[PDB]
From Swiss-Prot:
It is found in: Membrane. Coiled coil: none annotated. The chain holds residues 1245 to 1348 of 1486 of the full protein. Residues 8-111 form the PX domain. The gene is PIK3C2G. Belongs to the PI3/PI4-kinase family. It comes from Homo sapiens. Generates phosphatidylinositol 3-phosphate (PtdIns3P) and phosphatidylinositol 3,4-bisphosphate (PtdIns(3,4)P2) that act as second messengers. May play a role in SDF1A-stimulated chemotaxis. This is Phosphatidylinositol 3-kinase C2 domain-containing subunit gamma. Highly expressed in liver, prostate and testis. Lower levels in small intestine, kidney and pancreas.
Length: 111
């Protein structure tokens, strides 16, 4: 485990929907060296990431996955953006091992 790296992930934020499809969230990832990259992910892909992290990090306190069944989540784009933003800022601040895990890096740094 390497600490204090450059291309590791610091933050990730929703810019809006992808131009390819509004089923995909356009996410800007800021690396530790302050360079940015973009990825596009569906809600199902966020769900799968969370599921994987729960299995891999059984002893850590992970953040709550968004409550998608609340009506504003279904009806409001901005609600979904806010909830995913809050999820991402928490999931990148659990531990070094979570932030630098293969599933987190693969999620954020893939197209």
């Amino acid at each position: 485990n390497l600490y204090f790296q450059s291309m590791s992930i610091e933050r990730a934020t929703i810019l809006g929907f992808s131009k390819k499809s509004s089923n995909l969230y356009l996410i800007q990832v800021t690396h530790s060296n302050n360079e940015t990259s973009l990825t596009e992910k569906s809600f199902e892909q966020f769900s799968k990431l969370h599921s994987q992290l729960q299995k891999q990090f059984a002893s850590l306190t992970l953040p709550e996955f968004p409550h998608w069944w609340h009506l504003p989540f279904t009806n409001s784009d901005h609600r979904r953006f806010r909830d995913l933003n809050h999820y991402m800022e928490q999931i990148l601040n659990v531990s070094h091992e979570v932030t630098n895990s293969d599933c987190v890096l693969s999620f954020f740094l893939s197209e």
